[PDB]
Subunit: 254 residues, 4 copies
């Protein structure tokens, strides 16, 4: 090991879902900086072209796809493999809807589980195929502190359920592909200052509880989550598989 | 304070999904014997009459219903509340399908998540509505050791993820309803000698591994899991909510 | 299994450390009620004779011993075995001292670790000997939510460390003696309304945080912890070993 | 935001206990290479000069000290702060002793807890005093997979408990010091090829079990653990506190 460059991704190609926004985009930045070539994936065209414009030459492909469409993920991988061999997958596509359990409509529940969990499996199966064949790769899933504990004061039982699945999916694929050289880990972030959370931050009857419940007393910055993903996705994490890495300002300690 | 009857369910009415087979049936027996009345729910009509014929007078209703059909769970709660106020719910309806991640049909993934996760939500929302209203209720979810660790040597990634979701779902509804007097807990059984594990117990290249990995060196008995559901469901467990109780012969210890 | 009497301890003898107060004494009550004969252990003579006076004929022996003195535990077991064969051990002797980490005196730290952890091992080794020889027994340790998360707002790093050890000691002995028929589990209680906590309850700048941090919004009652121990120590828990059972009003869910 | 140097330790001074051997030494190498200066601490004087002779100019001091001696850690912090303000602490000093629970000498139990647990507290209190004062610091504790699960087939109950205490100690000091800008995290390595595991790696009735139980089918390399300590210690991990990071080749996954 050469510690100086062991955190770099030189030569590597990363597929990132949810690349057009928030944490997904900051990981694209981090990975570009680190020597990686990129495959940007996002359902949102406007967002994607912005991502790509900014990331410039590190962009191998930019693909408009919904992670819940499993043949779009199979198609995306095939495209990917032609263009650059993909050795890293970051599953950042996710959504969160507030709801009370007794006033949940079936579509809200089904959709959160479809994006957060099904989509993550479809992407991991599509891209993990070529990794498992080469006997080499790394996957990093965006879980949440919500896969460990339950947020307060707001209710979103479908998000909590989805993040529980995410953590165990992570471990299930880690165990299954360990012997064949693919590592799979998850980040479990606390509150992060991105697009997913701005609406919730503008109400102080919520934001105040948030910070008082977090030992560091602040939201994380997207770059703080990106750095953790960078670590997990790089050769520095070569003995790290099936791990749930908490990046939460201590929220889960209390 | 009466310790000799703290574990009893006298004058309660419990709804049990998966009542037709294995652990769900043993639970009904356990609850019948502790003085509860039973609302029995299974998609298998044949299994239901057998269950009901055996339970006798303890049976207040038997309802053929697919837990994945949200509007059928809601109706089932309506029917059940009309016979007697339902103060206990056991979500035991569930499936397992073996599959290699790379060779997974979309439909297998979808269906395991539908029954194990979506179905538990649909039932819990339907039956918990009146409990929340009353300020009183106990729900027992069938989680698994598979929501904490990953089984070997067989592969079933959908199952691990579904059980991750079961544990977080349990915790989310525990948190949301604690203030209104409804407790929500899960069991995380190890291998149990039932119908769900018959095909696999017939295969020593799986079976000898199972016992080896189990400190107690044996499968659990359906009644060992039932006794533990009885605890969670009873007044004995009145300060226990959001708990995931391992009943696994030490499996998650190693 | 006969569910009606499966929670009873008829014929059994339980050694309980910390029997003179709080949770230890309420478990003596619960176990007496349930058909068990008792060995009371406590360093405090006044407390012990009060315990024994109240528990009456269920008391086989009453022994004044400090759990940190390992030959007193070896001696106590030998005495025990002459008088009644001890098939159940409850480790409830424990202490808690508030301190700031940077203003901790070495004696406070050493003493908490000595009572909470060393004492628990000395008792478990002394009494577990005869259980392991018979190939039968049950141990229940008093862990804490403090072995999982960190209390707030008060500081007691030595208590948190001690409870971490307690949970893993539990699992280590469960794994070691599983094959030889001794089960070992821990309770991890939340705030409980006993002697250990009255001082802390009388300051509202503390008590208020406590309840607001607990989903059920109340302290537990000693009987709620006793019922859980009763469950773990009885034949109902026969497939339950190495488990950490949270009894905390949901405190660890959030 | 500079991802190319986020993992660097330029201008920091790190104190490492257990610097003389195995993982503690590899960590020093890692930190030396990331631009940090080193305060080296070990009870073995011989091992220290070897460490220091190899590290070269990166070594600001080498201090022979027994971590179990509280007043020696305090003095060591005083000495170290006088050379350069210490902003990183790695608590790597630790031992393992195999013993059957029933045949355990008191002294073995005591000594494993003294080094692994008490010693980490003494060092963390001593070095964290000035860090807390500065409003800035990172501590990395050497936890273990043995603080989460129990090893097999060999028995070492003191070690499992000590590591339980290490994980909760880490979390307690994370919570207490988060508001004053000192992060505190632990690693939970799997088997690592070092001096601590040489005797046991020589015994195939243990060794073949070790690898079988490890999804990655191999021991970790000291440098794989070091790379992960570097992450925790660096600005890359700035929103990570109270985390227990598994570096175990998937061991805790099964
Ligand atoms: N506080 C936080 O932001 C926070 C905390 C913990 C975990 N996380 C998780 O980390 C991940 C990223 O969240 P973040 O805030 O950047 O979110 P974000 O909303 O800022 O970004 C999400 C991105 O995913 C895309 N997306 C949504 N559904 C999609 C679909 N079906 N197909 C393709 N793309 C889709 C959106 O277009 C968007 O670009 C999510 O999995 C989230 O649940 C976020
Ligand atoms: N080894 C084990 O048996 C084991 C271990 C851990 C957890 N569990 C969990 O315990 C629960 C019950 O398992 P068990 O072995 O009795 O299984 P089982 O297969 O014996 O019984 C399952 C019952 O659920 C019913 N069911 C299935 N889908 C349904 C649907 N959509 N609607 C209504 N009813 C439906 C089936 O008809 C059957 O009667 C499951 O959640 C399972 O995952 C089992
Ligand atoms: N809020 C709570 O009370 C709470 C919460 C979580 C866990 N617990 C744990 O459950 C257990 C019991 O606490 P509880 O409130 O009854 O405490 P308590 O102080 O009411 O009772 C403790 C008893 O243990 C005895 N004791 C203390 N040190 C001893 C020693 N060295 N040898 C023998 N006896 C000794 C005391 O004499 C007393 O009778 C402890 O392990 C405690 O840490 C308590
Ligand atoms: N398989 C593994 O090696 C493994 C796995 C998980 C965790 N760990 C943990 O990592 C840490 C370091 O282990 P490692 O294998 O390098 O061990 P090692 O035995 O190679 O190195 C331990 C170092 O600590 C020093 N030391 C011991 N007692 C001391 C004391 N009282 N004061 C000062 N120094 C003392 C020793 O001299 C030695 O240099 C330990 O806490 C260990 O429990 C090791
Ligand atoms: Mg919490
Ligand atoms: Mg395991």
């Amino acid at each position: 090991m050469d510690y100086r460059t062991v955190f770099r991704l030189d030569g590597a190609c990363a597929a990132v879902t949810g690349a057009g926004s928030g944490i997904g985009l900051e990981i694209c930045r981090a990975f570009a900086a680190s020597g990686a070539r990129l495959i940007l994936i996002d359902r949102e065209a406007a967002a994607l072209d912005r991502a790509a414009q900014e990331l410039g030459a590190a962009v191998a492909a930019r693909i408009v796809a919904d992670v819940t469409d499993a043949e779009a993920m199979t198609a995306a991988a095939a495209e990917a493999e032609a263009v650059a061999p993909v050795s890293i997958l970051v599953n950042s596509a996710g959504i969160a809807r507030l709801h009370d359990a007794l006033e949940t409509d079936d579509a809200t529940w089904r959709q959160v589980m479809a994006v957060n969990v099904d989509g993550m499996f479809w992407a991991s199966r599509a891209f993990g195929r070529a990794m498992v064949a080469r006997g080499a790769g790394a996957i990093v899933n965006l879980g949440s502190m919500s896969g460990t504990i339950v947020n307060r004061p707001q209710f979103a039982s479908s998000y909590m359920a989805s993040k529980g699945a995410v953590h165990q999916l992570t471990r299930a694929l880690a165990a299954e592909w360990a012997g064949r050289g693919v590592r799979v880990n998850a980040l479990a972030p606390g509150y992060v200052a991105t697009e997913m959370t701005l609406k919730m931050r503008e109400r102080p009857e919520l934001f105040e509880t948030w910070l008082d419940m977090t030992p560091m007393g602040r939201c994380g910055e997207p770059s703080e989550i990106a750095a953790a993903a960078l670590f997990l996705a790089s050769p520095a994490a070569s003995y790290v598989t099936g791990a749930i890495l908490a990046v939460d300002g201590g929220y889960t300690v209390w």
